[PDB]
């Protein structure tokens, strides 16, 4: 419908807020979470990825689908590199480190 | 949009400031023949680039009912403003008579314009 409207006018037209549009507002968005100080802080210290996935889905209806992991995290020596790489859909028994980011789908709330 | 046009002629032109002239007077002269009464004359509205139409207006300013809507023939808003559903005829012309890498592709504009109006 928005495609047709843009095709008709070649512009984006404003409109007054109605309950139907406000209900249409509620969707899911792409986000990243840190395990340093969130509710999953204790679980991110050596816990498994599956427990995090289950807790996020059951509690906040959050869908975790990837780990953005610090590149120099498997090395014992400390490093100053802040680069991170992408791990898509890790298994249930995948281990977690506190310096990880979790891809997630947030639900809209007011 | 404020004025209401019914039983008129809409000439859509794919003009350009550097394209070759097509001599629009040869289209307006037969429609302004003296054997038609004044009330029988059909309003003519040119929809196209004003840069191209300024080069042609020198030979068109002596005719009674001619209007210009600066814009493009490929926009539904301009066609709705000119009441395309009540016109007697829509004439789609392509001024860009320049050579193209493929001969058939020279008709890429007009065909799409037609397929717009039918939809």
What's the resolution in A?
2.7
- Chain B residue closest in CA terms to A11: B77
In whole angstroms, give the CA distance from residue A98 to residue A94. Answer: 13
Inter-chain CB proximity B77 and A7 less than 8 Å = no
- Please spell the DSSP secondary structure of B56-114, one letter per residue: HGGGTTTSSSEEEEES-TT-HHHHHHTTGGG-SEEEEE-------SSSGGGGHHHHHHH
Residues in chain B with CB shorter than 8 Å from the CB of A10 are 75, 77
* SS3 letters across A44-97: CCCCEHHHHHHHHHHHHCCEEEEEEEEHHHCCCCCCCCCCEEEEECCCCCCECC
Structure solved via: cryo-EM
CB contact B112 to A (< 8 Å):
no
């Amino acid at each position: 419908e928005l495609e047709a409207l843009i095709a008709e006018e070649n512009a984006l037209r404003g409109g007054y807020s109605t309950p139907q549009t406000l209900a249409n507002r509620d969707r899911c968005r792409v986000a990243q979470l840190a395990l340093l100080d969130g509710p999953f802080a204790d679980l991110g210290d050596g816990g498994c990825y599956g427990d995090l996935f289950c807790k996020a889905l059951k509690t906040y209806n959050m869908l975790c689908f990837g780990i953005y992991r610090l590149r120099d995290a498997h090395l014992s020596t400390p490093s100053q590199c802040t680069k991170r790489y992408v791990i898509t859909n890790p298994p249930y028994e995948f281990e977690l480190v506190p310096t990880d980011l979790i891809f997630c789908l947030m639900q809209f709330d007011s | 949009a404020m004025t209401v046009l019914s039983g008129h002629v809409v000439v859509c032109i794919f003009g350009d400031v550097s394209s070759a002239l097509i001599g629009l007077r040869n289209l307006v002269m037969p429609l302004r023949a003296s054997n038609f009464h004044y009330h029988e004359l059909k309003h003519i509205v040119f929809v196209g680039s004003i840069e191209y139409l300024k080069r042609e207006w020198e030979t068109l300013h002596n005719f009674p009912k001619v209007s210009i809507l600066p814009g493009t023939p490929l926009s539904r808003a301009d066609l709705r403003a000119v009441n395309i559903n009540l016109c007697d005829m829509c004439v789609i012309l392509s001024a860009n008579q320049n050579n193209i890498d493929d001969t058939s592709l020279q008709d890429k504009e007009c065909i799409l314009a037609s397929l717009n109006i039918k939809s």
